Amino acid sequence: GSVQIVYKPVDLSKVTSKCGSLGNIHHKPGGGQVEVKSEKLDFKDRVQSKIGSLDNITHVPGGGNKKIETHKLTFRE
Amino acid sequence: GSVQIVYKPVDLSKVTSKCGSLGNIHHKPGGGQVEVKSEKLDFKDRVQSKIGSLDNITHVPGGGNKKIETHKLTFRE
Amino acid sequence: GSVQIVYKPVDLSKVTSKCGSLGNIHHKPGGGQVEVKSEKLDFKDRVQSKIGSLDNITHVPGGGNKKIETHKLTFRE
Amino acid sequence: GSVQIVYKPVDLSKVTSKCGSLGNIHHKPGGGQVEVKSEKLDFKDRVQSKIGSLDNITHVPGGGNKKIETHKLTFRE
Amino acid sequence: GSVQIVYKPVDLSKVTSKCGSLGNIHHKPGGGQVEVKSEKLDFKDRVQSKIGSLDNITHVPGGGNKKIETHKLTFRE
Amino acid sequence: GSVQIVYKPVDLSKVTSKCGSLGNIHHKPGGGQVEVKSEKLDFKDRVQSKIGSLDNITHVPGGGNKKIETHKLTFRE
Amino acid sequence: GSVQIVYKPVDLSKVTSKCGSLGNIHHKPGGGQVEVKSEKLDFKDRVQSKIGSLDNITHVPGGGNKKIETHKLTFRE
Amino acid sequence: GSVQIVYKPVDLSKVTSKCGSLGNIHHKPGGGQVEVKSEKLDFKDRVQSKIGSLDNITHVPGGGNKKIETHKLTFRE
Amino acid sequence: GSVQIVYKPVDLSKVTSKCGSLGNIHHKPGGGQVEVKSEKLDFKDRVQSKIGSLDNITHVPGGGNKKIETHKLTFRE
């Protein structure tokens, strides 16, 4: 028996944006306090931990448009 | 038996942006305090830890458009 | 049995941006305090740790457009 | 049995940006304090540690467009 | 059995940028203090450590466009 | 007519204290934010104003005993 | 007419304190933010103003005992 | 008429303190931010102003005992 | 008429202190930021102003005992 696989996806997707003006943004955090106590930490695989954190992010992209596109073809015999 | 695989994805995706002006951004954090106590740390695999952190990020891209596109073909016999 | 693999992805993706002006950005952090206590640290694999940190980042790209594109072909017999 | 692999990806991706002006950026950090205590550090593999840090980065590229493109072909018998 | 591998990727990717003007950048850090205590340090593999750091970076490229492109062909018998 | 004033107050007041131990005091404020708007301020006499304030006081006296003692004699003819 | 004033206050006041130990005091403020707007300030007499303030005081006296004692004699004819 | 004033205050006040030990004091402020806007300032008398302030005081006297004692005699004819 | 003034205050006040030990004091400020805007400043009398300040004081006297004693005699005819 013959097996024929044709995988032909066609993509014409426009993920666009327009913005006439993008301004006047004031991010003014007022401090804070974080206290973390631990004794034993054992991270043994794909760990992405984040302990004892006080972060401030001002993220102003003029765009920021995202496009994630995954293609998987799994052939087994 | 014969096996034929044709993998022909076609991509014409435009991830664009426009911005007439992008300004007047004030990121003004007010300090803070982080205190972390530990004794034993054992990180043995793909670990991405982050301990005892006080960070400030002002990220202003004029674009910032992202496009992640993964292609996987797995053939097994 | 004969095996034929044809892997022909075609990509014409434009990840662009426009910005008329990109200015007037004030990142003014106000200090802070980080205190980390540890005794034993054992990092034995692909570890990306970051301990006791007080960072300030002003990242203003005129573009900042990213395009990650991975291609995998795994053939097994 | 004969095995034929044809791996012909075609890429015409433009990751571009335009910026009329890119200016007036003030990064003014206000100090801080980091205190880290440790006794035993044992880093034995691809470790990328960073301990006791107070950094300030002003990263203003006129572009900053990134393009990561990985190609893997694994043939096994 | 005969094995034929044809690996012909074609790349015409332009990672460009334009900038009419790129100026007026003021990076003015205000000091700080880092205190690190350790006793035993044992780094035995590809270690990239960085201990007790107070750094200031002003990175203003007129371009800054990056293009990482890896090609792997692994043939096993 | 003769006027005789005898003003003889006698004071033997002991304002004392004892404390066997005075310790283990943790004052840990968590920031905050104060915003004050004004236009016209006109303070013309014994004014003791305090505008736009974020204060933290840890006052631990081993004593702290106070003794205010006022004496007034007003003679008029 | 004769006027005789005798002003003889006698004071034997002990304002004392004892403390066996006075320790272990941790004052750890976590930042904050103060913003004050004004246009006209006119302070013309004994003014004790304080505008736009972020203060931290750790006042640990081993004593701290206060004794205010005022004496006034006003004779008028 | 004859006027006789006798002003004989007697003071034997001991404002003392004892402290067996006075230690282990940690004042650790975490930054902050003060922003003051003004246009016209007119201070014309005994003014004690203080504008735009971020202060940290660790005041540890082994004593700190205060004694204010004012004597006023006003004779008018 | 004859006027006789006798002003004989007697003072035997001991403002003392004892301290067995006075140590282990850690003043660790974490920076901060002060921004003051003004246009017109007109200080014309006994002015004690203080504008745009970021101060740190560690005041550890072994004593610190204060004694203010004012004597006023005002005779008018």
Place this chain on the structure above:
Amino acid sequence: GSVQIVYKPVDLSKVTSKCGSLGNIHHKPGGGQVEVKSEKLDFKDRVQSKIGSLDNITHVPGGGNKKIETHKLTFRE
């Protein structure tokens, strides 16, 4: 009429202190930032101004005992 003024204050005040040991003092400021804008400054009398300041004082006297004693006699005819 005859006027007789006798002004005989007697002072035997001991403002003393004892300290067995006075040590282990760590003043560790972490920087900061002060920004002051002005245009017109007009100080015309006994002015004691202080503008744009970032000071650190470690004042450790073994004594520090103060004694202010003012005597005023005002005779008018």
